[model samples]
Target: MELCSGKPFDAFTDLKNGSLFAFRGQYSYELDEKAVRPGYPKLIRDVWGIEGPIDAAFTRINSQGKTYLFKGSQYWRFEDGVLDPDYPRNISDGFDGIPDNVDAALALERVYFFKGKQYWEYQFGTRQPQFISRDWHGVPGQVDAAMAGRISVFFFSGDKYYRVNLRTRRVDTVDPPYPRSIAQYWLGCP
Candidate 1:
């Protein structure tokens, strides 16, 4: 539930097993500053392993419990920490409406994709070209990271984090909010 690197990260996704994964520079971490185990990392190792810009790493899990990672113009699908076959595919094929270099994303009643000051919605099976919006029920734009819990959705922006209360059905802030930026929040300032 915290980021402990004392710096900004490139992307994040809470794995199905309840572990957090994030990327920064040429490395990735397993929430507590631990490396991603040994099996993975190679997929993203080459960076060029996929298509698109190298920095915009956004991730979210679908209803099927598979993780989808989006960077420039392509996306990778992973299940059980294993990359699915025939991945690094065109983003347009899997996500018809989402564009390349997304800032953040999360799944709930529907899939929400964020970029700069706008967001898009995609509901699988019946997904159509999404409508872009400036307000996410009061959440701000230019998000940096996002992940979903059973009910609540967490979003990170500008070294801060916010919550979308599912029970209240409105955006809300966490007490003692963001703890002096994302990294310091968990690792503490030096």
Candidate 2:
């Protein structure tokens, strides 16, 4: 409707207003210490996609370099180069980062990759690099990488997620929606 009226912001506002057709479901759970509150330690609300309904899945990686993904209960594997199912389960590209086959969106300043420990940045669409993270020293377990073009990772040094940009050398801390692992996530748009 807004597009026809040439008022995109108004359109967005309408969308935000929601519609009768929209499905509504509310879930309340205690926050992890890392995600006590929004803009606090900065929590991870999404391991993959949280934009819509969600489900639980389990996957098993077996020998011969193969993975078997399942839902409630199922299994599969590729041995002798044959794909077969041992059990049946639901699978989606939503949370399967590797299965999604998404390339690592690298930038001129891949601070997250440069050092497993330290703050990080979330870059996107070939734009000028912006410091989207602060210095976080947590190598290995703490500092890692995940789905690119979605969530940006930054380890916690203290009470906030320090936003950093090497291009500008501007470091500012913003309270994120939840606490995040000191991993790397390339920001991107669908």
Candidate 3:
């Protein structure tokens, strides 16, 4: 998909089927562990009927979870990659306390919405927004995107990615260190 030569992604999320989707500009790419899937880089407008450059996205953490794509003050819900009926709903209506134009989102025990330096956690109710650095040590605020992996939550900022352990809630220390180049690792750039 030539992601290495392009700008950082606007948003990314993992589908319930385990497929990872990354969005940039007007196109979306399906990604495997090694590289982008063939015949990808599909137009967001064509696939989701949504405009380019979404702000945040995530698939809820449940068997009947639906995928959501956020932009401006609205969000779209999809079931099995097809847009649900009467969607593109106002964030204020669906997510009562979360702010508009969030920077990133991920779902664990609770759904999280990140914007600037603060993040809001939601389950049955919305928790007051808290500083990201205070809770997600070593992961900065204003992240470009975020997605949950098997054992970790990946946070993207600029061209680098941070892998935070799901259990520890802190950036994992590995041999190569974190904040690794997203282009080289995730996009398979040389």
Candidate of highest TM-score: 3
lDDT for each residue of candidate 1 in 1-190, tens digit (9 for 90 to 100): 2234355656666664466666655555554335544214333465334432233443445445777777777778876657789987887887776777788777664777777777677777323333223345666555777776677766776666666776864566656753236654532534
Model 2: per-residue Cα lDDT over 1-86, one tens digit each: 11112111100000111110111111112112244341122111232112212111111122232322222222223333255544
- TM match of model 3 to true structure: 0.92
* Candidate 3 positional error at 50, Å: 1.1
Sorting all predicted structures by lDDT, with the top scorer first, yields 3, 1, 2
- The total number of steric clashes, by the backbone 3 Å criterion, in model 3 comes to 0
Of 2 and 3, the candidate ahead on lDDT is 3
State the TM-score for model 1.
0.72
Estimate, for each residue in 1-190, the C-alpha lDDT of model 3 and write its tens digit.
4556646889999774657788888988777655546426789999889888899999887887788899999999998758999898999888888999899998775788999999999884687899998999898776999998778899999888899998889999985788888887666776
Point to the candidate with the largest lDDT. 3
TM-score sort, best first: 3, 1, 2
- Candidates in order have lDDT scores of 0.61, 0.22, 0.85
* Clashing residue pairs found in predicted model 3: none
